[PDB]
Symmetry: C3
Subunit: 303 residues, 3 copies
């Protein structure tokens, strides 16, 4: 891998670039360092990644880029807490992040409820996220695609549970309950990473941290990536108006003037608390929280 | 098919949604109700639809969405006049609507004349529309694609004539002559649906009604769909300027300020008269005309 | 080929139209006139073109359209100086123009340097242009794709050198040195087209003339094509800001107000001198220089 990449890829605020045919190679490098070169047979791994790529749709935000972006943050976190996680947790978490928003259409779980989409019926809650996980299992079941074929039956099942759990946590609606719980448990000292239940919740926050990691990049990246996600939200807002429903101001394109305020409110109520709590639990994740604040100050500089 | 769809799909102002991989299933449902489950062998029908889909290009307006939209209106009209049409007319009209603007490039017959396109030479008048029909026959001749293989030789030929005739009527230039003729014939009581010549002209107006049915949707749908068609017209206007020709204000992107007036003039001169005459001939088609007027009032509310 | 095309395709300011599936046929016509019908076996030639088409990416400016546009200018120049070039130079120059910006991503050699892209390492200078040529050889080596299989070993090698040389000259950074040299040599009468070294440099200027030939079209074409290239530059400018680097005002989308001035400065410093020197050396290329000036006056009419 090129010289500037090797150096900067260890940084939290890294951007993966505009060259799509490098991302597969970038991801493999992250796996070969955090996990190891023995972890996965390489032939099977590329085959897997190509298929995951194939099943990300060409939407503005929730796309193959995001997937690899989200995965890299998880790599940074893994590299700065190398002593904390097992072989199977490092294997399963990078993979989870890559598959975490598979076959996403660019519509929230809200919109899939009110459209009466077949997926809403099949999955009552966390619609897209269970889909994302089902897609993941489908891709694993293709021939030459079981990247976990070295594993024993016992180990295979645990890593699927990690991945299953992790992906679900990316449902932003479950983050709030999960953080408030971790906040309590840190302050009272009851939080303990040898307790599998506690361990799950931290990983959950880790996944939320990564899912939002566009707010921990440099300002030019954070501001341009904002255009992508509004492209999706305004589209979903247009489809709400088609249903006759009034969409919330976050998705109404006729309220671009209220964007600065919304970003302000979103950092205060969600982004900052996320990285605040994450830093407490994993001190080496400070840069995410710092970079987050820098972008919060820039949203103020607008208004 | 999902609960909200079953209910609302019987409504004229229905929108088919942003999910492409439902449209095939929606269309089949419309066929299985208006026509019947025996009408078409299902294996052959999907194969047919997939190929029709494949031959719609990715243009802003005249696309796979429009095709299915236009087809649904025809279904609503069929369902509210179930007693008027034969087996072969219901078979052939939904199919015609789906294929009616096949392989459309997003350029009018006007622009294909002045570019000296090979299609202009091959079809002097109604260039795109004969193309649309030729495309349709090509798709029917593929193996496993003759959805009319149950039919006798006699019946097959008639349904092709229905489809041939119907598609041609979508040429907006032929609508004016066809309406004025139907207006006369209704008022003087000479109009008679047992006269095959009269029958053809009504179907013609039905196809024009469906081709324009974006003006009979709810206001948010009608207004956003407007953006799509101007995307095409302004592109064609750009290609005129490339030829050195001055394009008409409908296609000049430098005259966005004249859009409200143009829509006003278009409803008065074309859209309203179309649905006015259609209501007289088929009373159950009132909702289209009402919805049309509601959108006319909204264009006034602008200026 | 259609009547209006036959006529206008001999004109310098010709536009190739918005119909992609004609461009292959247009290009073959240009080859069959300037070069001849014996030059290339037709089966192999289409196969070649389809593959070249396949390897142009869907970027705003540097795309399959540009390639065919650039190639046509070269055809006009060839047709108005028919007595000056050999069989192998006519074969090789149209082909070179079609392949000249193969697999272009829409990023300059500047951006590929600062991203530390693998191509920057492989080709120190003229990064994209050597790539373009390598792509060309790759496409020639496919089975049924050696359009130069009639040629003797001797002739094949020379035409590859013509193509190699020509493509490299499209690197705008090498144009300045090449023009200043030709300017001197014309005025002092030392310039001589029987001297292979001099011959190369003229061809170089010819390729630069063609690469920029969007400035020698009619004004509506020149002005709209401008939107395409800024789409690319502003994207590259966005990727610079992502790297933390400040991009030059040509690529900063926040400076759209400085576009008129930039186009002004670009015509004076590059475009006009190019066609000025080209006219001196090949008098029949006057129309390019005239059309160029007309577009320079229109940029003044803005400010
Ligand atoms: O700048 C990079 C983006 C920022 C937003 N991201 C989000 N990810 C998940 C959920 N929500 C995100 O941001 C949306 C945009 N926000 C809001 C909220 C309220 C608003 C009210 C009015 C106008 C705009 C609003 N935007 C939340 C991803 C990275
Ligand atoms: O709102 C949904 C659209 C409305 C227009 N449609 C049309 N279908 C077929 C033919 N023409 C249509 O509308 C065009 C837009 N109109 C005009 C006419 C004159 C204008 C003059 C100046 C500026 C804009 C104009 N638009 C006709 C489809 C649904
Ligand atoms: O109008 C048709 C285009 C004109 C520009 N073309 C160019 N080709 C190769 C290299 N450069 C081209 O133009 C770019 C645009 N120019 C500039 C230069 C300085 C600027 C400064 C501020 C803002 C915009 C600038 N654009 C050069 C292709 C055809
Ligand atoms: Zn998600
Ligand atoms: Zn995500
Ligand atoms: Zn049509
Ligand atoms: Zn149509
Ligand atoms: Zn180039
Ligand atoms: Zn070029």
């Amino acid at each position: 891998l090129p010289v500037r990449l090797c150096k900067e890829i260890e940084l939290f605020h890294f951007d993966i670039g505009p060259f799509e045919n490098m991302w597969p190679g970038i991801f493999v490098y992250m796996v070969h360092r955090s996990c190891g070169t023995s972890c996965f047979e390489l032939e099977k791994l590329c085959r897997f990644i190509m298929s995951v790529k194939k099943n990300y749709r060409r939407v503005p935000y929730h796309n193959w880029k995001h997937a690899v972006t989200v995965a890299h943050c998880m790599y940074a976190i893994l590299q700065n807490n190398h002593t904390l996680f097992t072989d199977l947790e490092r294997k399963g978490l990078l993979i989870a992040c890559l598959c975490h928003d598979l076959d996403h259409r660019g519509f929230s779980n809200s919109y899939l409820q009110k459209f009466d989409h077949p997926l809403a019926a099949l999955y009552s809650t966390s619609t897209m996220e269970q889909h994302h996980f089902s897609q993941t299992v489908s891709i694993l079941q293709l021939e030459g695609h079981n990247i976990f074929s070295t594993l024993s039956s016992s180990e295979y099942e645990q890593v699927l549970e990690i991945i299953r759990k992790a992906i679900i946590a990316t449902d932003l609606a479950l983050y709030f309950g999960n953080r408030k719980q971790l906040e309590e448990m840190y302050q009272t000292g009851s939080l303990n990473l040898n307790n599998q239940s506690h361990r799950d919740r931290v990983i959950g926050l880790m996944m939320t941290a990564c899912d939002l990691c566009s707010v921990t990049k440099l300002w030019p990246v954070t501001k341009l990536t904002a255009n992508d996600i509004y492209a999706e939200f305004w589209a979903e807002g247009d489809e709400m108006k088609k249903l006759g429903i009034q969409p919330i101001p976050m998705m109404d394109r006729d309220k671009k003037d209220e964007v600065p305020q919304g970003q302000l409110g979103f950092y205060n109520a969600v982004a900052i608390p996320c990285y605040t709590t994450l830093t407490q639990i994993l001190p080496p994740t400070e840069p995410l929280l710092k970079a987050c604040r820098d972008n919060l100050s820039q949203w103020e500089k607008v208004i």
